[PDB]
Scaffold this motif. Sequence first.
Motif, PDB file in Angstrom:
ATOM      1  N   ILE A  31      73.422 -51.062   1.101  1.00  0.00           N
ATOM      2  CA  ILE A  31      72.039 -51.326   0.715  1.00  0.00           C
ATOM      3  C   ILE A  31      71.739 -50.713  -0.647  1.00  0.00           C
ATOM      4  N   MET A  32      72.267 -49.513  -0.894  1.00  0.00           N
ATOM      5  CA  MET A  32      72.033 -48.831  -2.168  1.00  0.00           C
ATOM      6  C   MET A  32      72.658 -49.581  -3.335  1.00  0.00           C
ATOM      7  N   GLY A  33      73.834 -50.174  -3.128  1.00  0.00           N
ATOM      8  CA  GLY A  33      74.432 -50.977  -4.178  1.00  0.00           C
ATOM      9  C   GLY A  33      73.586 -52.178  -4.545  1.00  0.00           C
TER      10      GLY A  33
ATOM     11  N   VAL B 184      62.868 -43.116  -6.513  1.00  0.00           N
ATOM     12  CA  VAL B 184      62.787 -43.086  -5.060  1.00  0.00           C
ATOM     13  C   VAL B 184      64.183 -42.982  -4.460  1.00  0.00           C
ATOM     14  N   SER B 185      64.318 -42.105  -3.457  1.00  0.00           N
ATOM     15  CA  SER B 185      65.580 -41.819  -2.794  1.00  0.00           C
ATOM     16  C   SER B 185      65.288 -41.653  -1.311  1.00  0.00           C
ATOM     17  N   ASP B 186      66.335 -41.373  -0.531  1.00  0.00           N
ATOM     18  CA  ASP B 186      66.142 -40.989   0.874  1.00  0.00           C
ATOM     19  C   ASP B 186      67.241 -39.999   1.232  1.00  0.00           C
ATOM     20  N   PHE B 187      66.873 -38.729   1.355  1.00  0.00           N
ATOM     21  CA  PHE B 187      67.839 -37.688   1.675  1.00  0.00           C
ATOM     22  C   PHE B 187      67.959 -37.441   3.172  1.00  0.00           C
TER      23      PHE B 187
ATOM     24  N   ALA C  83      75.673 -36.421  -7.298  1.00  0.00           N
ATOM     25  CA  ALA C  83      75.517 -35.945  -5.931  1.00  0.00           C
ATOM     26  C   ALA C  83      76.442 -36.761  -5.045  1.00  0.00           C
ATOM     27  N   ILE C  84      77.024 -36.110  -4.032  1.00  0.00           N
ATOM     28  CA  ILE C  84      78.114 -36.685  -3.247  1.00  0.00           C
ATOM     29  C   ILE C  84      77.833 -36.408  -1.779  1.00  0.00           C
ATOM     30  N   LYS C  85      77.608 -37.464  -0.997  1.00  0.00           N
ATOM     31  CA  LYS C  85      77.478 -37.356   0.454  1.00  0.00           C
ATOM     32  C   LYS C  85      78.783 -37.802   1.099  1.00  0.00           C
ATOM     33  N   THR C  86      79.319 -36.982   2.000  1.00  0.00           N
ATOM     34  CA  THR C  86      80.621 -37.262   2.591  1.00  0.00           C
ATOM     35  C   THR C  86      80.494 -37.542   4.083  1.00  0.00           C
TER      36      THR C  86
ATOM     37  N   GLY D 165      76.774 -48.920   5.624  1.00  0.00           N
ATOM     38  CA  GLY D 165      75.600 -49.754   5.446  1.00  0.00           C
ATOM     39  C   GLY D 165      74.631 -49.158   4.446  1.00  0.00           C
ATOM     40  N   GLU D 166      74.470 -47.834   4.476  1.00  0.00           N
ATOM     41  CA  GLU D 166      73.632 -47.164   3.485  1.00  0.00           C
ATOM     42  C   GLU D 166      74.181 -47.393   2.086  1.00  0.00           C
ATOM     43  N   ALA D 167      75.482 -47.176   1.905  1.00  0.00           N
ATOM     44  CA  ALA D 167      76.103 -47.466   0.616  1.00  0.00           C
ATOM     45  C   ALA D 167      75.857 -48.913   0.209  1.00  0.00           C
TER      46      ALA D 167
ATOM     47  N   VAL E 149      77.948 -27.046  -2.570  1.00  0.00           N
ATOM     48  CA  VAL E 149      77.187 -27.690  -1.509  1.00  0.00           C
ATOM     49  C   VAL E 149      75.703 -27.558  -1.808  1.00  0.00           C
ATOM     50  N   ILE E 150      74.978 -28.672  -1.683  1.00  0.00           N
ATOM     51  CA  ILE E 150      73.560 -28.730  -1.991  1.00  0.00           C
ATOM     52  C   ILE E 150      72.717 -29.204  -0.818  1.00  0.00           C
ATOM     53  N   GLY E 151      73.334 -29.556   0.301  1.00  0.00           N
ATOM     54  CA  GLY E 151      72.568 -29.977   1.459  1.00  0.00           C
ATOM     55  C   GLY E 151      73.487 -30.414   2.575  1.00  0.00           C
TER      56      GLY E 151
ATOM     57  N   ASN F 274      62.609 -56.424   1.097  1.00  0.00           N
ATOM     58  CA  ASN F 274      62.520 -56.360   2.553  1.00  0.00           C
ATOM     59  C   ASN F 274      63.130 -55.074   3.103  1.00  0.00           C
ATOM     60  N   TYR F 275      62.975 -53.979   2.366  1.00  0.00           N
ATOM     61  CA  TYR F 275      63.441 -52.667   2.793  1.00  0.00           C
ATOM     62  C   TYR F 275      62.231 -51.782   3.057  1.00  0.00           C
ATOM     63  N   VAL F 276      62.085 -51.332   4.306  1.00  0.00           N
ATOM     64  CA  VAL F 276      61.045 -50.376   4.664  1.00  0.00           C
ATOM     65  C   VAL F 276      61.631 -48.973   4.577  1.00  0.00           C
TER      66      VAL F 276
HETATM   67  C1  LIG Z   1      74.343 -38.619  -2.371  1.00  0.00           C
HETATM   68  C2  LIG Z   1      73.257 -39.444  -1.990  1.00  0.00           C
HETATM   69  C3  LIG Z   1      73.407 -40.397  -0.976  1.00  0.00           C
HETATM   70  C4  LIG Z   1      72.335 -41.224  -0.607  1.00  0.00           C
HETATM   71  C5  LIG Z   1      71.096 -41.086  -1.228  1.00  0.00           C
HETATM   72  C6  LIG Z   1      69.985 -41.912  -0.936  1.00  0.00           C
HETATM   73  O1  LIG Z   1      68.959 -41.760  -1.609  1.00  0.00           O
HETATM   74  N1  LIG Z   1      70.169 -42.924  -0.037  1.00  0.00           N
HETATM   75  C7  LIG Z   1      69.219 -43.878   0.224  1.00  0.00           C
HETATM   76  C8  LIG Z   1      69.242 -44.503   1.473  1.00  0.00           C
HETATM   77  C9  LIG Z   1      68.319 -45.502   1.788  1.00  0.00           C
HETATM   78  C10 LIG Z   1      67.348 -45.910   0.868  1.00  0.00           C
HETATM   79  C11 LIG Z   1      67.310 -45.322  -0.392  1.00  0.00           C
HETATM   80  C12 LIG Z   1      66.304 -45.731  -1.313  1.00  0.00           C
HETATM   81  F1  LIG Z   1      66.768 -45.833  -2.502  1.00  0.00           F
HETATM   82  F2  LIG Z   1      65.336 -44.864  -1.324  1.00  0.00           F
HETATM   83  F3  LIG Z   1      65.762 -46.912  -0.951  1.00  0.00           F
HETATM   84  C13 LIG Z   1      68.251 -44.326  -0.699  1.00  0.00           C
HETATM   85  C14 LIG Z   1      70.963 -40.129  -2.243  1.00  0.00           C
HETATM   86  C15 LIG Z   1      72.022 -39.310  -2.617  1.00  0.00           C
HETATM   87  N2  LIG Z   1      71.912 -38.409  -3.617  1.00  0.00           N
HETATM   88  C16 LIG Z   1      71.411 -37.176  -3.442  1.00  0.00           C
HETATM   89  N3  LIG Z   1      71.040 -36.491  -4.548  1.00  0.00           N
HETATM   90  C17 LIG Z   1      70.555 -35.249  -4.451  1.00  0.00           C
HETATM   91  C18 LIG Z   1      70.166 -34.560  -5.609  1.00  0.00           C
HETATM   92  C19 LIG Z   1      69.705 -33.248  -5.509  1.00  0.00           C
HETATM   93  C20 LIG Z   1      69.317 -32.563  -6.660  1.00  0.00           C
HETATM   94  C21 LIG Z   1      69.385 -33.189  -7.894  1.00  0.00           C
HETATM   95  N4  LIG Z   1      69.842 -34.508  -8.011  1.00  0.00           N
HETATM   96  C22 LIG Z   1      70.235 -35.192  -6.852  1.00  0.00           C
HETATM   97  N5  LIG Z   1      70.434 -34.683  -3.236  1.00  0.00           N
HETATM   98  C23 LIG Z   1      70.808 -35.356  -2.130  1.00  0.00           C
HETATM   99  C24 LIG Z   1      70.669 -34.780  -0.861  1.00  0.00           C
HETATM  100  C25 LIG Z   1      70.152 -33.496  -0.736  1.00  0.00           C
HETATM  101  C26 LIG Z   1      69.999 -32.910   0.520  1.00  0.00           C
HETATM  102  C27 LIG Z   1      70.366 -33.613   1.661  1.00  0.00           C
HETATM  103  N6  LIG Z   1      70.887 -34.907   1.542  1.00  0.00           N
HETATM  104  C28 LIG Z   1      71.039 -35.493   0.278  1.00  0.00           C
HETATM  105  N7  LIG Z   1      71.293 -36.604  -2.234  1.00  0.00           N
END
Ligand SMILES: Cc1ccc(C(=O)Nc2cccc(C(F)(F)F)c2)cc1Nc1nc(-c2cccnc2)nc(-c2cccnc2)n1
Length: 277
Positions: A63-65, A152-155, A41-44, A59-61, A19-21, A131-133
């Motif tokens: 948009i990410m695809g 860029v990600s969104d955790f 990384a795996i979000k459940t 929906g998050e999945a 578990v990482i978060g 068109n993604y804020v």
């Molecule tokens: C599993 C997963 C699911 C969704 C996202 C994510 O970025 N979603 C997202 C949603 C909207 C918009 C975007 C966008 F890309 F930024 F535009 C991304 C990332 C991840 N990957 C992820 N990688 C990682 C990770 C950590 C360390 C090294 N590599 C990857 N951490 C975490 C994380 C940590 C703590 C709490 N929640 C999620 N998540």
Amino acid sequence: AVLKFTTEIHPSCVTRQKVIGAGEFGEVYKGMLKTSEVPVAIKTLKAGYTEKQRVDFLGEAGIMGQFSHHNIIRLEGVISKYKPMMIITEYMENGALDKFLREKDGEFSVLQLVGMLRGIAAGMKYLANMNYVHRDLAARNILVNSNLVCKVSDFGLSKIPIRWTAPEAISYRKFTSASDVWSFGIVMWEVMTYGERPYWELSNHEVMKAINDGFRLPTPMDCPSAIYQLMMQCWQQERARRPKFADIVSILDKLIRAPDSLKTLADFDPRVSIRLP
Ligand SMILES: Cc1ccc(C(=O)Nc2cccc(C(F)(F)F)c2)cc1Nc1nc(-c2cccnc2)nc(-c2cccnc2)n1
């Protein structure tokens, strides 16, 4: 129709390891994925999730695809046909940019730092054009790969990120790509300071008061004049006067391609004085 640009992964291909978060209704794991093993990384979404949670998760999945860009985290795939449902992304050994820079203070060249900013800006230009804020752009939401490429990600929220957020988004909830530009300016400052806390020990109310009174973050140490000028323009009170992401990408690219432009440094305002002969 939500999962058009996503690959469906069979559960036998996924191994959750540690578990990482914390997700919104389920844990986030580090794991292994086996197709063609790669770290993922795996979000459940765990048993008992509500309809709203399911809608937001899929929906998050979805948009990410849709996103396919060098500077956006890559979706490996989704488990939607079995429980628990999963969103599976690439995994970065170097982790999130904020912790990374704090643990590597002073180890990079100015050109390396500016190159990270160009990549972040290119990812943000892509999102804005799609068109993604983003609404939560901060170094804590950016992953760094083993080539120093920022994704860029969104955790999710760590806590409301007042000190990354543009005034109109705080005041009346107007989140747009122009409020993301404000956030990007804060990210520029985080990068050039190796992960310092924006506004140091000021409280959230003190930060908003300072911004409304016209104060802005001072230049980082050793910061190219052009880079400080750019972050300052990201922090214009009037939304319409901020650069667009296309402008930011263009400037950063030109500065990198003519790197002598980065040798002129903004004056650093000393906090201490040391008198010596
Ligand atoms: C599993 C997963 C699911 C969704 C996202 C994510 O970025 N979603 C997202 C949603 C909207 C918009 C975007 C966008 F890309 F930024 F535009 C991304 C990332 C991840 N990957 C992820 N990688 C990682 C990770 C950590 C360390 C090294 N590599 C990857 N951490 C975490 C994380 C940590 C703590 C709490 N929640 C999620 N998540």
